[PDB]
């Protein structure tokens, strides 16, 4: 019965009379008995929402905000707070300089977001993200925990809400949370917000330049698995955009160590990050190589077996580390001394898919650059399998599988053979698989790289008299004559050589 009265009183002009009622009203909502009475009365909820909104008293706000907070623990409560436009008003309390009001506000908003349909869209219209992000400078970690979780529910599956967070300086703020705080629950909710934004094609660099890479890597060995995993997935999504950032040295040592974790998923993520973090970046290549990188990546392939989800990123990483940097030879070389060859060469066999076979053809290409690798690669049965894949690849291009064009395969294999043919023993085998007729036909490719390695393989081979007549007798002379004139010095250099030895 009191409800209809206070409702009246809250709509009074004498503000003194109003705050008086919000106090009482807020004392009635403590007991579920009187609480229901309130939820059940639209004039009571509106009343309150309108008072908290319009009020200018630092306690009428407290009590009004306090009241609808205690109303949001139940289903019928949330609807009443929603149907009376209470969200725009709660977003308005997010600017209060009074913590209580603030606290009561982010909690009620969190509740509506979690259970009230229409809440998410309402908070965005009311400009909730911008305000929420402004509140990331607060020093109360629990407040930050609920605030950050709000951003995660609003941003999830919403690029717009994502672009607004980003445009409000959000990234650099969450990233600073990861540098300063040790409260696991905060770190978690934040990490989850960074995770959702790292898939966005605008947020990534914002997160990378603010130092997100180094700050997600700070908690890689914290005890919390959920924290670790989230930090890893986020680091993986950011990795293709982090290839040129300095200071990755420590995150590199940690990632290596994690390959030896007990969680395949952790190992999988880590092999992913090392794979991307090693692309075209010499500083990173050497760091991986310095802290046990090769042996660890190699051990990862072995441990993984058929799991392409692991072998692939890991094999790509070995590929990156074995080229274009001062110690590429030291790497190429180290993969043998750590017993990698057996499992590498084995990966070209079934049931390996093309994505992996391609990447593995590249590692092999690179590993053959090292003379001490020729005999080993041969004795593991590389030439025969490299030779039949090329054949399957060549025939397709005459007969874009799995995202892998067969011409790239045609080039790599023939590329690896061009290199392996630097040994006399290897040469015998290559000839022995009647390949000369196939490389010759490879002279007629519209692609230069292909002509180069075909010419290239044929130059090595032709230094053997008989094999030289084999090529000549194959019709090589004609096409080579044209290749003689290419602008691609490589193709012309090798063009001119076969003819000479021929």
């Amino acid at each position: 019965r009191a409800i209809p009265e206070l409702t009246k009183l809250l709509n009074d002009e004498d503000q003194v009379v109003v705050n008086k009622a919000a106090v009482m009203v807020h004392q009635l909502s403590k007991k579920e008995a009187s609480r229901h009475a309130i939820m059940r009365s639209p004039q009571m909820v509106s009343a309150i929402v309108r008072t908290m909104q319009n009020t200018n008293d630092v306690e009428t706000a407290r009590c009004t905000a306090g009241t609808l907070h205690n109303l949001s623990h139940h289903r019928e409560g949330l609807l009443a707070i929603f149907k009376s436009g209470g969200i725009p008003a709660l977003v308005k309390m997010l600017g209060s300089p009074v913590d209580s009001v603030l606290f009561y506000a982010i909690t009620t908003l969190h509740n509506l977001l979690l259970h009230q349909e229409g809440a998410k869209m309402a908070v965005r219209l009311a400009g909730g993200l911008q305000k929420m992000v402004a509140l990331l400078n607060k020093t109360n970690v629990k407040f930050l925990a609920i605030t950050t979780d709000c951003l995660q529910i609003l941003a999830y599956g919403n690029q717009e809400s994502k672009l607004i967070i980003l445009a409000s300086g959000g990234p650099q703020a969450l990233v600073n949370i990861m540098r300063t705080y040790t409260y696991e629950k905060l770190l978690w909710t934040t990490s989850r917000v960074l995770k959702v934004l790292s898939v966005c094609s605008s947020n990534k660099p914002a997160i990378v330049e603010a130092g997100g890479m180094q700050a997600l890597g700070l908690h890689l060995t914290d005890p919390s698995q959920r924290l670790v995993q989230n930090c890893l997935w986020t680091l993986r999504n950011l990795s293709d955009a982090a290839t040129k950032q300095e200071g990755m040295e420590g995150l590199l040592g940690t990632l290596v160590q994690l390959l030896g974790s007990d969680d395949i998923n952790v190992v999988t993520c880590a092999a992913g990050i090392l794979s991307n973090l090693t692309c075209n970046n010499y500083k990173n290549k050497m760091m991986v190589c310095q802290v046990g990188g090769i042996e660890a990546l190699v051990r990862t392939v072995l441990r993984a077996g058929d799991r392409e989800d692991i072998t692939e990123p890991a094999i790509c990483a070995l590929r990156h580390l074995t080229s274009r940097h001062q110690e590429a030879e030291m790497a190429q070389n180290a993969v043998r001394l750590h017993y990698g060859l057996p499992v590498v060469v084995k990966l070209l066999h079934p049931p390996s898919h093309w994505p992996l076979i391609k990447a593995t053809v590249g590692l092999i290409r690179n590993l053959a650059l090292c003379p001490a690798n020729h005999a080993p690669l041969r004795e593991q049965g590389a030439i025969p399998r490299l030779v039949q894949l090329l054949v399957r690849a060549h025939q397709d291009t005459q007969r874009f599988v799995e995202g892998v064009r067969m011409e790239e395969i045609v080039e790599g294999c023939t590329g690896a053979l061009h290199i392996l043919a630097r040994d006399v023993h290897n040469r015998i085998v290559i000839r022995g698989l009647n390949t000369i007729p196939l490389f010759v036909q490879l002279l007629y490719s519209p692609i230069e790289n292909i002509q180069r390695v075909a010419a290239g393989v044929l130059c090595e081979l032709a230094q053997d008299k008989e094999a030289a007549e084999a090529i000549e007798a194959e019709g090589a002379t004609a096409p080579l004559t044209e290749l003689l004139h290419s602008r691609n010095e490589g193709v012309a250099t090798y063009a001119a050589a076969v003819l000479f030895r021929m």
Binding site: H110, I146, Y156, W233, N276, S323
Partner: peptide, 24 residues
């Protein structure tokens, strides 16, 4: 240029007790 190629990853994906002690 751009030798080594990248792999693209886009894995997008208990506060009740936190909230009660934040108000009380």
């Amino acid at each position: 240029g751009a030798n080594d190629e990248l792999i693209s990853f886009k894995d997008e994906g208990d506060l009740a007790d936190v909230k009660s002690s934040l108000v009380n």
